[PDB]
Design a protein around this nucleic acid. Structure first.
Lengths: 95, 94, 95
DNA sequence: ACTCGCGAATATTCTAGAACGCGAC
DNA sequence: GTCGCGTTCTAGAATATTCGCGAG
């Protein structure tokens, strides 16, 4: 089972999780690290880690990278897109 | 006997801790209530084990897969364990 | 908080953690499961990340602990003995 | 500097292999 | 007497987390 991509989709898409959201084009995600730490690592639900760096490690394992051009983090994956949810099936850890 | 016991348990409102999910395609188990009323002292349906992990082993052995009172809500599902299609129960094998 | 063998040694030897202790001969450990869940699995300095006693059992077996052949659990490992800490070096994960 | 992003060890999660006793034939 | 079942204990394998750090 590939649970992490579906969980990430739920977090990004849901307006409860304000700290992690779609970017303006729906082709990447924006993360406000202080709010993320407060609402998703401190108290879809609830990661086991309290360390934002462990969450970044997961993003990287599933192929997310930072976008190159508020101190928001901006990540992207070709198979993580608002207008093409059917691509989510390709998100996997390497084996 | 286990498929029939599971069917009776999920369908019976007397046993609160194990029930159909919201869409009727899987079962929800409240572990504290299940242990309190179904594996240790609460016609009753009586398991012989007192350990929830052995019940989980039974669920897995018959092909169930993992997919709000106080504690861990477990959510299991099996394509052959179905509210509106009981005739599929014959396909359950250990 | 250090590797599982060192952590377990700390837990078993320290009287602060009442739920996990040496047996009468110092050749196995006794675990009171309700108390262990309350004091070593229930978040509010030695806390495991899991909240599940079954995951702790998985760790015990992974490092070679077995139940003593005749809740209060009694486990033993030939390399985990009160009067021989030098044996701890032989404990390995079965991987 | 300082950040990005991966290697590898450990922990956790979920499921299964196999032994053994018992109940239903 | 004989199997199938239920149970128990331990383990396989995938994921999640942790720790560390090389490259730019």
């Amino acid at each position: 089972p590939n649970n992490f991509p579906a969980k990430l989709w739920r977090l990004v898409n849901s307006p409860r999780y304000r700290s992690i959201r779609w970017d303006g084009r729906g082709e990447g995600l924006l993360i406000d690290q202080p709010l993320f730490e407060a609402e998703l690592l401190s108290p879809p639900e609830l990661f086991k880690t309290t360390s934002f760096t462990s969450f970044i490690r997961q993003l990287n394992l599933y192929g997310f990278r930072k976008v190159v051009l508020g101190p928001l983090h901006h990540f992207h994956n070709p198979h993580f897109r608002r207008d093409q949810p059917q691509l989510l099936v390709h998100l996997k850890r390497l084996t």
